[PDB]
Every structure is written in structure tokens, then in C-alpha cells.
């Protein structure tokens, strides 16, 4: 039950003694819609073979995306070969305000109301890595309190707890209203 987003198809061709040696590459992203995404680069001689090989590589590169409700915790800015992305949280009811390659990763993780920007290279491959690096630089409310050796409320702000606390109650009741 993962949504799959193909973001690029490029036909690369090595030149050999008799001509060229064309081949295809794909950059599909696989995401579960709740905060686990992975990227995958599959190269093959045919596009349906390339899209497939990218997929099996993607499913094995999953990693948790720390969410509060349906939006990331704090502003962040990661980097890749030359890509720069500016993930920043937003209030509920905003939509995924992101560009070309950043949308695919963000809409596969399941973040819903986030602001982004692409401040560097505009490649499909590099921007995908840049947003992944920015998402890996993310923290958690209970994790930071663990590092600094303090109770949670002395570290994270009151508004951050309210949003986190509310998300528990809304998710819990709808879960027990569909299971019980």
C-alpha cells in the first residue's frame, strides 16, 4: 500500500565502436503516506524494466520522517551534490507548497501542509537528494529532551505540545471509532 511517484526518465547512451549503446534510467520514489519514504535509481535497457528496478531499490531505503500532526517539526535546510531545499512547517490547511521534485518526496511521506523552496541546482536527481538530506536533519520533541536531559515541557514550546497533544486525541478517537 505505497504510492509510487516517477519523477524523471532520461535516456543515457554510451558511445561504442559501432555507434551508441542507449539505455534508460528512472528515479521513482516509494512512500507509504504516513512518514516513510525512500528514493531509488534503477538503470535498465527498457523503461518498464527501469521503473521496476528503481522501485525495488526504493522500498529498501525507507526511513522515518518525524511528524507532528501532518507537518514537520521545525525549519530545516539540507544539502546534496548541489541541491538546496528549505523545508519549513506550516499551519493546518495549507497544502504541499513545493516544487517539482520536492513535491514527490513530500507527498509520498504524507506531510500535507508544508512550505518549500529550491535554492540551488534544479536537477531532478539532485533535488531529490537535497530534500532527503533536509528531512534527515529533523529532530523530535521527545528526542531533544532526551539529549538535553530535561522533561519535555521545559524544552519544546507550549504551542508545539498543543499541536502534538491534539493530534493524539484526534487520531485516537477516529481509530477507536473505526475499530470499535
Amino acid at each position: 500500500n505505497y504510492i509510487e511517484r516517477v519523477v524523471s526518465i532520461n535516456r543515457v547512451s554510451k558511445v561504442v565502436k559501432g555507434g551508441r549503446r542507449f539505455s534508460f534510467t528512472a528515479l521513482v520514489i516509494v512512500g507509504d503516506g504516513k512518514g516513510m519514504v525512500g528514493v531509488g535509481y534503477g538503470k535498465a535497457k527498457e523503461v518498464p524494466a527501469a521503473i521496476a528496478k528503481g522501485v525495488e531499490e526504493a522500498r529498501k531505503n525507507f526511513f522515518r520522517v518525524p511528524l507532528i500532526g501532518s507537518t514537520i517539526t521545525h525549519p530545516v535546510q539540507g544539502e546534496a551534490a548541489a541541491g538546496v531545499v528549505m523545508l519549513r512547517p506550516a499551519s493546518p490547511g495549507t497544502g504541499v507548497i513545493a516544487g517539482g521534485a520536492a513535491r514527490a518526496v513530500l507527498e509520498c511521506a504524507g506531510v500535507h501542509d508544508i512550505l518549500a523552496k529550491s535554492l540551488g541546482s534544479d536537477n531532478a536527481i539532485n533535488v531529490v537528494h537535497a530534500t532527503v538530506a533536509a528531512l534527515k536533519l529533523l529532530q523530535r520533541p521527545e528526542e531533544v529532551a532526551a539529549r538535553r536531559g530535561l522533561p519535555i515541557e521545559d524544552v519544546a514550546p507550549a504551542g508545539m505540545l498543543k499541536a502534538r497533544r491534539e493530534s493524539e486525541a484526534l487520531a485516537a478517537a477516529a481509530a477507536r471509532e473505526g475499530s470499535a
Partner: protein
């Protein structure tokens, strides 16, 4: 020559933290002594000590690392550098890591952090971010 001992206090800590050093020896000063107090209370370092040396005193800062050998400081940044002084009014204060990271602000009431200035309504000159 040296133009910002507050800056080298932070860059010694950043270099030493990345290299997994366990002690950092710095020249001692009243301003640097007070900053180390805030880092200890907010829980970013373990302990600090003011000893003596050939000509003056000396600060040693016992750094803290996690039980699985992970860092306790995600980074440090100097804000108000010489040649561009950054003062924050009491109603527009900076917010590091959204609300998780913390800042050090030098105001008339003493070296206070980000949350303390909001609870007391005073403002002053920003010094640095630690998160």
C-alpha cells in the same frame, strides 16, 4: 589578532565536539564563565571548572556524549559579531529550531536565555544560538 573571544569559545567547542574530545581547555573570563553556566543549566554540557595557569585562570568544560556515542550538541552559531551588533527588542525575539533550540541574550538583568526574556519582558543584545 584576536577580535572576538566569545566566537573562539564557541568554535573551540564546535571543533572539539565534532572530534569527540572529552575536555576543552580555554582561557577564562567573566563573560565566558557566565555563558558556560547557561550551557550547563540548559543541559548542553556536563560540567565546567575554573582553574589557574601560568599567567591567568583557565576554563575546562567537560563535554557530554550519549550512551550510544552520539553527540549532545547539534551545533553552535555566533550571531552578534563585532562590526554588526544584533540587538533584539523584547517583543521580537529569535527562535532557534522553531522552538526547540535555545539562544543566549545579554540584557540588563544578566545573561538570560530566550524563554527567560519572554517571561520577564526585557530585551537586549543577542549573543549566540546553541541547539
Amino acid at each position: 589578532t584576536m577580535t572576538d573571544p566569545i566566537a573562539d569559545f564557541l568554535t573551540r567547542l564546535r571543533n572539539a565536539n565534532s572530534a569527540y574530545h572529552d575536555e576543552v581547555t580555554l582561557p577564562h573570563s567573566k563573560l565566558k564563565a557566565n555563558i558556560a553556566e547557561i550551557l550547563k543549566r540548559e543541559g548542553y554540557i556536563s560540567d565546567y571548572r575554573t582553574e589557574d595557569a601560568r599567567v591567568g585562570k583557565s576554563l575546562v568544560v567537560q563535554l557530554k556524549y550519549g550512551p550510544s556515542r552520539e553527540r549532545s550538541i547539534a551545533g553552535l552559531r555566533r550571531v552578534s559579531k563585532p562590526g554588526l551588533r544584533v540587538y533584539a527588542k523584547s517583543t521580537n525575539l529569535p527562535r532557534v529550531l522553531g522552538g526547540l533550540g535555545v539562544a543566549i541574550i545579554s540584557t540588563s538583568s544578566g545573561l538570560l536565555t530566550d524563554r527567560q526574556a519572554a517571561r520577564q519582558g526585557v530585551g537586549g543584545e543577542v549573543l549566540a544560538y546553541v541547539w
